[PDB]
Amino acid sequence: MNLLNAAPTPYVWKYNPVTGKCAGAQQNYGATIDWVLPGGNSFAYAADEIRRRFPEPAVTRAITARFEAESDQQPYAGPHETNIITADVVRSGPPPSAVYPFDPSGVQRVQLSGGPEMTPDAFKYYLRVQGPSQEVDEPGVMSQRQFMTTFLPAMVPHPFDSESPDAFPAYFSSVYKGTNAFE
Amino acid sequence: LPDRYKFSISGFDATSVAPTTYEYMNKRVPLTNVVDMFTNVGARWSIDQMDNVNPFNHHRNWGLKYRSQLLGNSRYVNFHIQVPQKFFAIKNLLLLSGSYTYEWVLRKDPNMILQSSLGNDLRADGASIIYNEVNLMANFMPMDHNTSNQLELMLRNATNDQTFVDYLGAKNALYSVPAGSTALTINIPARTWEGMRGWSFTRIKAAETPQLGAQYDVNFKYSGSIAYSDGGFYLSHTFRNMSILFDTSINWPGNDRLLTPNMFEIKRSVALDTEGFTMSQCDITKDWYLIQMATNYNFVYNGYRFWPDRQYFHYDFLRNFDPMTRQGPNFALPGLFDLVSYTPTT
Amino acid sequence: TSINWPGNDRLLTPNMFEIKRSVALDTEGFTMSQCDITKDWYLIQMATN
Amino acid sequence: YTYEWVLRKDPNMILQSSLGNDLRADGASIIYNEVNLMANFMPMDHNTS
Amino acid sequence: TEVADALSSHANSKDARSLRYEPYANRLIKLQTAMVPPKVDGTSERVAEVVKGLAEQGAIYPDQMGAIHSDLLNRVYTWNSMGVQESIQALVNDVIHGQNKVLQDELARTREIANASMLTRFFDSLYKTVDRGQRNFEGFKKLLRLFVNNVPNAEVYSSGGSFSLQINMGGQSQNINLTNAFDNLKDIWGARWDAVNNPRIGALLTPNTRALLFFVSTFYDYGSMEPGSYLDNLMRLYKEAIRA
Amino acid sequence: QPGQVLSYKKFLCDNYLWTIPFSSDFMYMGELTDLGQNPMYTNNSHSMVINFELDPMDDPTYVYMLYGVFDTVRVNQPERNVLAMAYFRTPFATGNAV
Amino acid sequence: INFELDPMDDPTYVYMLYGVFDTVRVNQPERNVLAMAYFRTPFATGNAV
Amino acid sequence: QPGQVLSYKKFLCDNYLWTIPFSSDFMYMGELTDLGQNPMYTNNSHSMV
Amino acid sequence: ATPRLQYFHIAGPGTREYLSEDLQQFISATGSYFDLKNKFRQTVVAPTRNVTTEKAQRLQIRFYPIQTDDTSTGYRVRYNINVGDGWVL
Amino acid sequence: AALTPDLTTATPRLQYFHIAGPGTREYLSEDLQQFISATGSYFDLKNKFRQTVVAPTRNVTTEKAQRLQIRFYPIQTDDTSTGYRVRYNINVGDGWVL
Amino acid sequence: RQTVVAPTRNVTTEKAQRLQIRFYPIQTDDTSTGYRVRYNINVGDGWVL
Amino acid sequence: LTPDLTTATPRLQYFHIAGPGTREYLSEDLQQFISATGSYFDLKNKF
Amino acid sequence: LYHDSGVCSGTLNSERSGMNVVVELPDRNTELSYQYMLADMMSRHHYFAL
Amino acid sequence: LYHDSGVCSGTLNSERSGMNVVVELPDRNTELSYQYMLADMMSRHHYFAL
């Protein structure tokens, strides 16, 4: 066979979880088959067929989204979590069925040790359920799973040949020249 | 004065008691010429014989002077004190409804819990403590239950929950430096430094520093001011220089930022000085002086100036950066016999 | 560089695989099998084996 | 830029006494060996500078 | 010149008493600069525009911007004549042509980039700094920007300098103008929401302005504006009115 | 004689604890410094060496080196008496003996 | 990976074993034609093209 | 001897004029207090001792 | 909000909303050299509603250890902070 | 609809701990911020929610090698009895500001 | 070769769930013949003990 | 030699003795610059 | 109090969530952090005997 | 430094435009100006050795 027509190893991405920005991509050497010294002609074709059978990025995106859906740890509460978040807000604060005395006497009230308005459970849950005041995510930073949905591992044949894309190791393009920078 | 500048009193003998006992410090008179009325008679000059001696271990320590007199004039004190919680995660935590159990263990080491103005071994001096009752006081706002449940419910919401940081914001590493040694190398494993704030460093005497994370330090026989625990730093001098190399050979400044680009020359001797590199009428360097003023006061490129807005801080630069200068006779000359002896006959 | 692998509050010691601890220095327990091996480490080893 | 300045050598000008005595008659003197000029430059980005 | 519009107006026009309420020196300075206008040198700014366009077009790097500009000032001043100044103006018109040609590119991309670019030109087309309430002004500009970006059917255009905004609700499309709204929004940035200002500037707001900031406040933060301003506490009400 | 004298320029600085900011211009520009979010250190591993030379004392001492770390806690209390704290330190997350 | 060890009195290694699938597939497609292809999943040694 | 000593905890307070705020939570919530407008005292006579 | 209190601005509206609007401009304009802002009283009124329980509630609670387990090196104490609903600690 | 993010797996680890987050004014809920503003003179929660100012990290300090401090020796001295002159050639290089 | 493959879904939580809980005694009653202990095993929802 | 002393600019306004004010004679870019970089490298005292 | 000690630390935790939420590291400094926090919060020449 | 002396003043100037752009008048007080400015910006009891 011809190695120029052989499928290249995919570029896997580095997430950099703390900053949240992409840490770049690398040649996926961590999962490679040893096939030229021991394998020869019988295994060169096999390794090529394995490499070109690497899923296209859309398929990998679908697989990763399906894997993430079965987590049980989605960012927002599912029926299991929201049922108990409703249950504890229901049993929080002054009880609704507690018949207590309201004494509007400007002399000689009762002690009322206990243990005339009340808040409804709808608003009580509304306080607990509402999100931040931002309601929009800052650009650049992404969580692990939203980074996995985008930025997918893919075979990139002939990458360093085009007009002016090169690659994204760690940079910030400024002057129309790809300035891999932040040194 | 340090023990090396003292002598016995003709009835006292060394090795009979530890050098960290009270009657050892009492029965060792200092040399009378190492400091006296003629010691640099016209110079505002900290005694170089005690520049490395803890100044907070002094009977003029007004803070400890007040702290000791709050317990009484006797050594038999029925103390009743209120100690704040200081762990950053729970220092200002605002607990909501529920049942919480919160246990904590209190030191019984006299050297740890008590501070002497002399730094003697309190365990060897018969000091001890007994805790009779330790109760936990809590104040609760009597706010309306119709609103505190609302308040607790807007605090149970995950988008708005408490976040607490340690004010120091510094990992603490103690690197041993023996007596005769003058250099120290701090190598660290490979790391990402993902949000590092910078470096802070002084040197603390190992005799005044307890074992870290120790239930009870047995080699700690000192009861003065632990400079590690409090801010009682007094050895910010005795740093000739320092260098940073993030990789094996990559200096962090590494852009000819400093006048000595490969090192943070904190101070250099003015006697050997030829090119300058000494600022504020002392031996601190131009490079290091800019580093300190830029860090604390945020304006060095617009001009050096004093910053009264941070004098209260008690831990900034300008309030306690004290340069001094003396002249001294030049001995090792035909005259000028240096008639003051600093070595006792022991 | 900072994501502990268990990282889900699995172990009684949150940020390490504490294999053993000094029982004389021990205060809160966390030692298994009448020796200085920890509850967490004993759990991991027996689960693995 | 060319920036020149001249330094005083008068003992009464440059030196202050707690008595105010004439220092020229009292042998006060000064000799300048190195008078160098220093400056601080902000390393602000050349793009924005 | 407010002197010209103070002379040629009614008896006590707003700028006929703006000069009046100035101190004597400031009023005299305005009077002098109106009567005998001081001349201004076009170059050393046109050259700056040329070098900024050169760096923007990628011809030169911004690191060498100032050096190139000053060398060009040498080359101009040592030959400053009618014939070189026309070349300077030709290069400035060249910069303008290039900028407009670039703009025509983003009006051909996705509409959510076209309206964003037109909004950037609108922002460049008015004042960039206000004497009072600058934080309110930039917070409003950012809120409007992200409102246009996050509303898929927002369409920004210009009609003779009047930058309008179209919002299509399917069955209807309410048009709100931005030039007259921002003109009305002057001296309301530094508002200081309190008892007397609310009647004062509640009758100062046109239906166009209230509609604009009502639509903008659908994406409104507590970290957008000054925490005690009239615009801040007005968008606080309008956002929850939209919500409920 | 003037040739029989010397100079002893010296400084004392108590309660200070020399600080060096991990900022590209040594001026405070936020707690999360200029280079602490520079993705040449954050993305890429580094192993620094810090070299000191000190005035030699006569007694064993430590060198109390304080790095710059973001040790924060996010205290989450989702239900009644359900208390959970999450600890995070940015440069030194493992918190081991270094 | 971070380790804390009891300090011994002689130089020692730390025999670290990861978990890998270091497998072989042996192909003999024809007579006296032998061919293997080695694959190790996490810490792959192999051929990047 | 420790049994032959006593303790005399005491405090001095000069120029203070002990104050008790007529507020619900004993804290400053406005110069006109919480209970100063409660329509128990304001609207009905009470005779404190 | 008694009119007797409002007339003396003890429980009244407040300075910014009862002075003549021209006077507020005047006192603010001449506020750097001829201060008149101390001559028109204003009182901050307490919330007086929905801010404090009438329920008999302890203002300051003492917690004493369930377990002590004293030893020669330290002195442990174990507490149990019971925070009921409507209580925030 | 309720938010249930698990920490120690939050994944950004900076935004969640507000080390490099949005800011306290814009991550606390509407109602909680209103509550803090209203009940902010007697019962303080401002210190219980962390906010960090972030360095500009771009176009504010060059990676180029620039000297922070430059010493200018005299080019002409002309020492006399009454005064001491010094003449310097101060150079502010390309892209430099002094 | 034949390899046993783990389920990897719907078998283990990704939530921060403590893998081993130590229950302090609520209430003790230490006597001379017996030592009582009373615990509160609060098995949260979704947990199995 | 400057193109401003050549013209009829009032002396008080030219030297900002009775001029308009730094908020309104500086270029609108420079006010933003000095405000943005006002915490570490101030330029406000130079105008 | 035994701060900074991971071998003899304190313990704060709830009942439903039995895991301890107070973890202390030997490389932090609780006491010095309070000293720096308090000194920045107020001048240190003030004497607060409580 | 020879301030406010027109006979022995300094000279700051550029090269292309060699005109001296510092003029010191004998009727001004530079040192007292610095004294008043420095006393206004901050209290004078602070001892700044630099």
Author numbering:
A (entry chain O): 1 to 115, 174 to 241
B (entry chain A): 445 to 790
C (entry chain K): 692 to 740
D (entry chain B): 544 to 592
E (entry chain N): 16 to 259
F (entry chain A): 840 to 937
G (entry chain K): 889 to 937
H (entry chain C): 840 to 888
Give sentences from the paper.
Here we report the high-resolution structure of an aviadenovirus, the poultry pathogen fowl adenovirus serotype 4 (FAdV-C4). Adenoviruses stand out among the icosahedral, non-enveloped viruses because of their large capsid size (950 Å, ~ 150 MDa), triangulation number (pseudo-T = 25) and complex composition. The capsid facets are formed by 240 trimeric hexons, with twelve pentameric pentons at the vertices. Minor coat proteins IIIa, VI and VIII on the inner capsid surface contribute to modulate the quasi-equivalent icosahedral interactions, along with the genus specific outer proteins IX (in mastadenoviruses) or LH3 (in atadenoviruses).
We obtained high resolution 3D maps for two different FAdV-C4 strains: KR5, and AG234. Model building was carried out for the KR5 map, given that the AG234 map presented a disrupted particle lacking pentons. The structure shows the general characteristics common to all previously solved adenovirus structures: hexons (major capsid protein) and penton base (vertex protein) arranged in a pseudo T = 25 icosahedral particle, with inner cementing proteins IIIa and VIII on the inner capsid surface. In agreement with the LC-MS/MS data, no densities that could be interpreted as genus specific minor coat proteins were present in the map. In addition to these expected results, we found that the FAdV-C4 hexon presents a unique insertion of fourteen amino acids located at the equator of the hexon trimer. The variable loop (VL, diff 3) is quite long in FAdV-C4 (17 vs 6 aa in HAdV-C5) and folds back towards the main body of the monomer, augmenting intramolecular interactions, in sharp contrast to the protruding orientation of the VL in HAdV-C5. The α2 helix in the body domain of HAdV-C5 protein VIII is 22 amino acid long, while its counterpart in FAdV-C4 is shorter (13 residues) and followed by a bend of 115º and another 12-residue α-helix (α2’). Additionally, while in the human and lizard viruses the first helix of the VIII-binding domain is roughly perpendicular to the connecting helix, in FAdV-C4 this helix adopts an oblique orientation, which results in a completely different conformation of the protein in each one of the genera. Interestingly, the N-terminal region of one monomer in hexon 1 (chain B) interlaces with the divergent neck region of VIII, while the N-terminus of one monomer in hexon 2 (chain F) crosses over the head domain of protein VIII, further securing it in a clasp near the AVP cleavage site (ovals, and 7c). Thus, the long N-terminal tail unique to the aviadenovirus hexon in combination with the different fold of protein VIII could play a stabilizing role in the capsid.
